[PDB]
Amino acid sequence: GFLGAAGSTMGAASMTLTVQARQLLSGIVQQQSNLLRATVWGIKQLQTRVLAIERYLKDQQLLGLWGCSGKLICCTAVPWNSSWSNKSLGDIWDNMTWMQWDREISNYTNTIFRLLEESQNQQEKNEKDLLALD
Amino acid sequence: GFLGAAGSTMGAASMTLTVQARQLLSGIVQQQSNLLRATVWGIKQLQTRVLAIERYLKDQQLLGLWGCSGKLICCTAVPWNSSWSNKSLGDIWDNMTWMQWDREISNYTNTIFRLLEESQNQQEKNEKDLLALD
Amino acid sequence: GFLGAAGSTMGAASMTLTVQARQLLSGIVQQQSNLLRATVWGIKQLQTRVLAIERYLKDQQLLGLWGCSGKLICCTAVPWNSSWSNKSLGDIWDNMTWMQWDREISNYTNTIFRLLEESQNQQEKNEKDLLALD
Amino acid sequence: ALTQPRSVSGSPGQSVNISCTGAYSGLGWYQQHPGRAPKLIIYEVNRRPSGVSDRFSGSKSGNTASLTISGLRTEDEADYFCSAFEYFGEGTKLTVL
Amino acid sequence: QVQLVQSRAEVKKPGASVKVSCEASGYNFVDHYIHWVRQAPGQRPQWVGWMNPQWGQVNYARTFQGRVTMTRDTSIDTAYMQLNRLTSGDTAVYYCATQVKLDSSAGYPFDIWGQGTMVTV
Amino acid sequence: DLWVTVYYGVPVWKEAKTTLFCASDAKAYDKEVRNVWATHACVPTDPNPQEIVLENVTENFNMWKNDMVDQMHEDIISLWDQSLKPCVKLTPLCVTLNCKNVNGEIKNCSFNTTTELRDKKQKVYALFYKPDVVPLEYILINCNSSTITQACPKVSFDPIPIHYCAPAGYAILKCNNKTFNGTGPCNNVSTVQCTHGIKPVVSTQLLLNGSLAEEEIIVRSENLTNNIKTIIVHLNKSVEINCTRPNNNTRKSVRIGPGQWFYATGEIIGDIREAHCNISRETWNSTLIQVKEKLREHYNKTIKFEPSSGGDLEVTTHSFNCRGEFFYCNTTKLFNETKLNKTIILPCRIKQIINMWQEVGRAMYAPPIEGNITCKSNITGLLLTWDGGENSTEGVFRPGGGNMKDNWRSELYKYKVVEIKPLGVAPTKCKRKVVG
Ligand SMILES: *[C@@H]1O[C@H](CO)[C@@H](O[C@@H]2O[C@H](CO)[C@@H](O[C@@H]3O[C@H](CO[C@H]4O[C@H](CO)[C@@H](O)[C@H](O)[C@@H]4O)[C@@H](O)[C@H](O[C@H]4O[C@H](CO)[C@@H](O)[C@H](O)[C@@H]4O)[C@@H]3O)[C@H](O)[C@H]2NC(C)=O)[C@H](O)[C@H]1NC(C)=O
Ligand SMILES: *[C@@H]1O[C@H](CO)[C@@H](O[C@@H]2O[C@H](CO)[C@@H](O)[C@H](O)[C@H]2NC(C)=O)[C@H](O)[C@H]1NC(C)=O
Ligand SMILES: *[C@@H]1O[C@H](CO)[C@@H](O[C@@H]2O[C@H](CO)[C@@H](O)[C@H](O)[C@H]2NC(C)=O)[C@H](O)[C@H]1NC(C)=O
Ligand SMILES: *[C@@H]1O[C@H](CO)[C@@H](O[C@@H]2O[C@H](CO)[C@@H](O)[C@H](O)[C@H]2NC(C)=O)[C@H](O)[C@H]1NC(C)=O
Ligand SMILES: *[C@@H]1O[C@H](CO)[C@@H](O[C@@H]2O[C@H](CO)[C@@H](O)[C@H](O)[C@H]2NC(C)=O)[C@H](O)[C@H]1NC(C)=O
Ligand SMILES: *[C@@H]1O[C@H](CO)[C@@H](O[C@@H]2O[C@H](CO)[C@@H](O)[C@H](O)[C@H]2NC(C)=O)[C@H](O)[C@H]1NC(C)=O
Ligand SMILES: *[C@@H]1O[C@H](CO)[C@@H](O[C@@H]2O[C@H](CO)[C@@H](O)[C@H](O)[C@H]2NC(C)=O)[C@H](O)[C@H]1NC(C)=O
Ligand SMILES: *[C@@H]1O[C@H](CO)[C@@H](O)[C@H](O)[C@H]1NC(C)=O
Ligand SMILES: *[C@@H]1O[C@H](CO)[C@@H](O)[C@H](O)[C@H]1NC(C)=O
Ligand SMILES: *[C@@H]1O[C@H](CO)[C@@H](O)[C@H](O)[C@H]1NC(C)=O
Ligand SMILES: *[C@@H]1O[C@H](CO)[C@@H](O)[C@H](O)[C@H]1NC(C)=O
Ligand SMILES: *[C@@H]1O[C@H](CO)[C@@H](O)[C@H](O)[C@H]1NC(C)=O
Ligand SMILES: *[C@@H]1O[C@H](CO)[C@@H](O)[C@H](O)[C@H]1NC(C)=O
Ligand SMILES: *[C@@H]1O[C@H](CO)[C@@H](O)[C@H](O)[C@H]1NC(C)=O
């Protein structure tokens, strides 16, 4: 279920990422307004509904600017600068949970997010335009 | 026009699916708030605008989790279990309309929707991650 | 920065399109509701956030119906009919700004936008369905 | 013009079964306990309202409404009325030996 | 709750007028129609008319037309039925009927009945 | 093989109801705070409505289970309370009125009101109609039940055509059968952007200013043979009525508070004359005959008419609004003959203290209109109720306007709100490129 693998290893958790993906917006299975009756609750509810779209659309927007809109897992060609983390493959994916990973690299994630938009998708598209020119 | 091919055969209707896709959200040609006046109609209008986005974003989310975000027609590799429907190709696409199709398989569509997210896009991405490792 | 290259040549401006793309929705770095206080400003604010979603979702919808959802730059196979503009390649990308272009072709953009959805993505998908049949 | 018989026989374990002919016959059936107001037992010839036992049921025909009660008891001795919109039937008294 | 309570039983003289009230409590009195139906002790029950408490909109059979007037007091949720020109053949028990706890919007049949008002004249 | 293939934008719908939306015509000629149905912020509609005719399909309709008439009736009530919210309260007017007659139907009442000063008291006179005053030496009719908020003289009660429009993601299905029963399938349906011009009139027994029929008169009810629901006799042709208030009334402004101004009826000059309406005689004579032909199709014998037996004054008469004044026209002269320019003249009495919708709360006071009043009733329907349990030789259809949703059902019978589900799964011979 939702956030079920929060304490599991990254390899086990990476298989059920679709479950956490469904629940950020819906939303509309649980209610539509609800117009079966027709107040403090009405204003509060609407601001929740607007906010759930604001957070969801930011993530698809960020995934969009990294050229990863359609996919939940995408690989890139920006290399991993070692100053961010010194840990190896086996020390990360089979021994650590996602909770403890976010705690250590959160300081420099912003310029990593800057590397994802500049280094690849802004270079790849200019190169891909020059590639399909012929 | 919008919903024009609702009584036509599936082959004829499948050519003009863009028309129904356009009008699901807009929306913004008819109004923006409107800020030309600056009431019961204001609260009523706003709750409809939120609902129109919220329902629209559910379908692109479902298409996203099936790896079909960018496309209106996508093919998969989940096989069609015969218990859902026993009809053949010529008995479906050139003799029946979409309205009568939704009526008969609606019981198991949720389990089918479970197959689209688990069987392919959750398996394809793990395999595709394991494929681009080399 | 945002809209920084509005007076530069199209070639120079086309490299930093990600900057203008980020700012149509966010949005959520500046505020979320805000739930730190708990009025005329509250109703005014909410109508801005709804409007910011709805216009933004139009552009990804239009890009979606042109099969360009994930990309900021996409090439097509609808040819450019000369009645729209008679200018050449060097008279457009290295001597003119995006501003003066929008003023001159805005009259027929709607039937161009009709060509992007019909001529390619509605034909390409039917052909691509007929192509993966074997 | 909505008619029904006056007395039909019955026994505990044997079904009591009433005919009711007429135009749009048997829209509702009422069990009038002797002393108080009647109470609806079935509406729309076969549907069952809340607050009545499962053994109360009705069957429809072309023009005759057949109310069938199975598993009689001594407390079910009452007058049964067949109604059609604003019309009403004659009345049928239960007979249990 | 969701019940109909009537007035005491009355016995009058021929020609006189009797008022049979039926107060309603526990539910939306205005939204549901108030029907009135008779039952002679030894005859089939005969239907008088209905009265919805929005504006009153009373309906009558010709066997009671010009003799019965139904009024209401919606502030106290009371539905009335007054008979004029009482004769010898106007003896029955008088029931107020409505339809609340049913899923049928057709207005018939009746499910909630009053306590009863036996009128002998 | 057969692998699923999802299509986005399929033309399939489900029966589901949503929140509608006003969209009035591009007629922002306001110049004053007016149009209590549009109010401030009802948006302009599409100048070119995209009416899209469909074929090839038969979809069922149910005009009595329609949720649009529940949503429209809730809006018109909400517009009624919202427009009266900033208007002038008539709380200090509920005092002992000293009324003397004029001869008539107008009583000359003098009462006692506080001025803008909270200590000084003034004595002013006003003309009040007879059914606006109950005996006590007189008071207003409902000062001991609820408060009275008079209508603001700036706003107008003229019903402009408003289009109820479903939002993005929904659709409105318009049935196009010329002789269309209501409940039952419709062979020729058309999805539209939204509805036609709907006038939100208030009227009992006589549906004024609506949509007309094309082929013939259609008689509409839930069950017909059931006597409990009103019968909507939707007309083919429309009769002509000239209603009037042919007495000269002056508007008197009575000072009752700071900003709160009480506009009463001043001195009447000219002739004391009754308000009347002329519903032809020839067009109505032909109208009732064509109604008889449709009513004889659902029966087998003669059918007669008779006026309303009882109820409140606002259903026994024919109520409507005629240039800001509410009429109550005695329609006994209409449904009199028993069937199987020499005009008929309906005596109409005017009320000012009106309690519309019978909801316990605001009951507005319509301010008088200076000068003569003339309007145009048009009639595109009738409201009839069947009589009780009777002999088969003949039946009576008493007129009657019940809940106001029957007024909207005469114009919202064509439409139906469905939700669009553009996701659809259908198997084909196509399969995507395999990973391995
Ligand atoms: C059913 O539908 C019919 C339409 O077929 C309606 O009949 C019309 O009703 C409207 C509103 O009641 C009438 O419009 C009003 O007419 C008044 C009289 O017009 C004369 O006087 C003016 C001014 O001297 C002249 O310009 C005009 O040519 C006429 O000679 C006007 O006084 C009204 O004006 C309003 O706005 C102005 C501007 O703010 C104010 O100064 C006024 O005080 C007033 O508020 C208004 O225009 C119309 O005349 C009727 N007839 C026709 C043929 O359209 C029925 O009323 C309607 N019935 C129901 C029950 O809905
Ligand atoms: C009443 O109940 C039973 C079951 O409904 C009746 O059986 C049939 O009833 C139908 C209609 O009520 C008749 O058309 C059939 O002819 C009946 N079949 C038989 C074999 O009787 C039955 O008539 C009644 N039961 C009794 C009298 O005990
Ligand atoms: C009026 O309502 C009655 C029931 O309340 C309907 O009568 C039923 O009609 C169906 C077919 O339409 C029959 O199969 C049933 O046997 C009838 N009776 C009952 C008790 O359900 C009647 O059809 C309705 N009138 C119209 C014109 O639809
Ligand atoms: C189905 O109904 C539609 C709508 O009423 C009809 O289309 C319109 O009606 C007349 C008669 O055909 C035409 O002159 C109009 O021009 C039509 N409108 C448009 C936009 O074309 C249609 O004809 C009906 N079809 C059938 C078979 O009854
Ligand atoms: C209604 O009654 C009032 C009582 O004050 C009348 O007002 C006065 O009437 C006398 C005539 O008897 C005049 O001399 C005064 O000038 C009036 N006073 C005011 C302030 O107008 C009023 O005329 C009566 N109206 C009608 C139509 O009878
Ligand atoms: C109601 O009034 C209308 C006009 O206000 C009358 O219609 C006009 O009648 C005159 C002769 O009386 C004709 O010359 C006009 O051509 C008519 N105009 C229209 C638009 O029809 C109508 O006769 C009146 N009806 C009644 C019953 O009084
Ligand atoms: C509507 O008008 C009719 C007649 O035009 C009224 O009916 C009768 O009118 C006569 C006067 O000519 C009275 O003496 C009777 O008492 C009236 N009633 C009956 C039953 O005959 C009718 O009263 C008028 N409607 C209202 C509400 O007053
Ligand atoms: C409607 O039905 C006819 C008759 O079978 C068919 O020829 C036609 O293709 C269908 N669709 C349209 C849009 O006419
Ligand atoms: C109005 O007030 C005066 C004195 O202020 C009093 O004499 C009179 O009885 C009051 N009522 C009326 C005129 O109805
Ligand atoms: C209000 O006053 C009228 C005047 O006769 C009276 O009939 C009615 O009963 C009063 N209402 C209440 C609730 O007392
Ligand atoms: C209305 O007429 C249609 C005609 O086909 C019929 O099917 C339907 O039962 C009718 N409904 C009523 C309530 O009479
Ligand atoms: C009404 O019509 C009938 C027959 O159509 C006729 O006998 C009668 O005289 C007509 N009435 C008037 C006033 O024209
Ligand atoms: C019915 O009333 C009208 C109204 O004036 C009258 O002209 C007519 O003679 C009356 N007819 C009958 C049969 O009462
Ligand atoms: C009133 O009826 C006439 C019929 O002569 C019609 O032409 C006119 O359009 C109607 N008025 C409205 C507002 O519909």
- CATH number assigned to the domain comprising residue E45: 2.60.40.10
Side chain identity at residue E65, one-letter code: Q
Round to whole Å and give the CA distance between F353 and F365: 4
Q: Apex CA A80: angle with CA A76 and CA A86, to 5°?
A: 145
Angle between helices B40-65 and F68-84 (to 10 degrees): 140
Q: Token digits for E35?
A: 């029907």
Note down the domain range covering E55.
Answer: 3-119
Q: Token digits for F28?
A: 């922002």
Q: Token digits for F237?
A: 């042709």
From the DSSP assignment, how many helices (H) and strands (E) are in chain A? 6, 0
Q: How far is CA E50 from CA A10, E59, F315, in A?
A: 72, 6, 16
F223 to chain D: closest CA residue: D85
Question: Tokens 């449709």, residue?
Answer: F294
What distance in Å separates residue A47's CA from the closest CA in chain F?
Answer: 18
Closest CA to F382 of F285, F287, F298, F258: F287
Atom index in ligand 7 nearest the CA of residue F313 equals 27
Asked whether the beta carbons of E113 and D37 are under 8 A apart, the reply is yes
Tell me the residue length of chain B.
134
What residue ranges line ligand 10, CB within 6 angstroms?
E 75; F 134, 144-145
Q: Which residues contact C35 (CB under 8 A, 6 or more apart)?
A: none
User: Which residues, listed in sequence order, are joined to residue B90 by a DSSP beta bridge?
Assistant: none
CB–CB contact A25 B57 (8 Å): yes
Q: Whose CA is nearest to atom 2 of ligand 10?
A: F144
Q: A11 burial class (0-12, 13-18, 19+ CB within 10 angstroms)?
A: exposed
Inform me whether the C-beta atom of residue B8 falls under 8 Å from chain F C-beta atoms. yes
Question: Tokens 């001869």, residue?
Answer: F103
Round to whole Å and give the CA distance between F2 and F425: 12
Coil vs helix vs strand at F34 = coil
Round to whole Å and give the CA distance between A98 and A102: 6
Method by which the coordinates were obtained:
cryo-EM
Strands D7-8 and F13-14: unpaired
Q: Token digits for E87?
A: 């004769």
User: Which residues, listed in sequence order, are joined to residue F10 by a DSSP beta bridge?
Assistant: none
Q: Which residues contact A130 (CB under 8 A, 6 or more apart)?
A: none
E31 to chain F: closest CA residue: F403
Asked whether the beta carbons of B72 and B18 are under 8 A apart, the reply is yes
Q: Is the peptide bond before B27 cis (omega within 30 degrees of 0)?
A: yes
Round to whole Å and give the CA distance between B85 and B80: 9
What ranges make up the beta strands (E) of chain E?
Answer: 3-6, 18-19, 22-25, 34-39, 47-51, 59-60, 68-69, 72-73, 78-79, 82-83, 92-98, 112-113, 117-119
Q: Token digits for F184?
A: 């039952």
Which H helix or E strand runs over F24?
strand F22-24
Round to whole Å and give the CA distance between F346 and F309: 18
Of B15, B53, B70, the CB nearest to C64: B70
What does DSSP assign to residue D64? B
Round to whole Å and give the CA distance between E108 and D88: 12
User: Which residues, listed in sequence order, are joined to residue F164 by a DSSP beta bridge?
Assistant: F22
* Resolution of the coordinates, Å: 3.5
Torsion of CA B33, B38, B39, B40, to 10 degrees: -10
Angle between helices B40-65 and C40-65 (to 10 degrees): 40
Closest CA to E19 of E77, E65, E58, E68: E68
Round to whole Å and give the CA distance between A50 and B49: 10
Instruction: Give which of A28, A34, A35, A37 to mutate to test F binding, by max F Cβ within 10 Å.
Output: A35
Q: Choose the residue to mutate in D44, D61, D86, D87 for probing ligand 3, maximizing ligand atoms within 8 Å of C-beta.
A: D44
From the CB of residue C75, how many other CB atoms can be counted at a distance below 10 Å?
10
F429 to chain C: closest CA residue: C133
Buried b (16+ CB within 10 A) or exposed e, F358-384: beeebbbbbbbbeeebebebbbbbbbb
Round to whole Å and give the CA distance between A121 and B7: 44
Asked whether the beta carbons of F233 and F216 are under 8 A apart, the reply is no
Closest CA to E55 of E66, E71, E36, E76: E71
Question: Tokens 């549901």, residue?
Answer: E32
Coil vs helix vs strand at C38 = coil
- Look at chain E and report how many structural domains it folds into: 1
Radius of gyration, CA atoms only, chain C: 20
Q: Token digits for F253?
A: 């402004």
CA F163 remoteness from chain centre:
15
Q: Which residues contact C131 (CB under 8 A, 6 or more apart)?
A: none
From the CB of residue C113, how many other CB atoms can be counted at a distance below 10 Å?
13
Round to whole Å and give the CA distance between F12 and A75: 38
Tell me the residue length of chain A.
134
Q: Whose CA is nearest to atom 17 of ligand 5?
A: F125
Q: Rounded to the nearest whole angstrom, what is the distance from the C-alpha of residue B130 to the centroid of ligand 3?
A: 65
What distance in Å separates residue F89's CA from the closest CA in chain B?
Answer: 20
- Asked if residue F240 has its Cβ within 6 Å of ligand 6, the reply is yes
What does DSSP assign to residue A118? I
Neighbours of chain E (3+ CB pairs under 8 A): D, F
- Asked if residue F122 has its Cβ within 6 Å of ligand 13, the reply is no
Q: Token digits for F117?
A: 């000063």
Please list every residue in chain C whose beta carbon sits closer than 8 Å to the beta carbon of residue A67.
Answer: 70-71
Coil vs helix vs strand at B98 = helix
Q: Which residues contact F222 (CB under 8 A, 6 or more apart)?
A: E105, E106, F64, F183, F229
C132 to chain F: closest CA residue: F430
User: Which residues, listed in sequence order, are joined to residue F265 by a DSSP beta bridge?
Assistant: F127, F251
Please list every residue in chain F whose beta carbon sits closer than 8 Å to the beta carbon of residue D24.
Answer: 225
Of C14, C26, C75, the CB nearest to A58: C26
Asked whether the beta carbons of F32 and F154 are under 8 A apart, the reply is yes
Asked whether the beta carbons of E46 and E113 are under 8 A apart, the reply is no
Q: A73 burial class (0-12, 13-18, 19+ CB within 10 angstroms)?
A: middle
Q: Which residues contact F57 (CB under 8 A, 6 or more apart)?
A: B6, B7, B97, B99, F189
Round to whole Å and give the CA distance between F152 and F92: 17
From the CB of residue A131, how many other CB atoms can be counted at a distance below 10 Å?
9
Asked whether the beta carbons of F345 and F326 are under 8 A apart, the reply is no
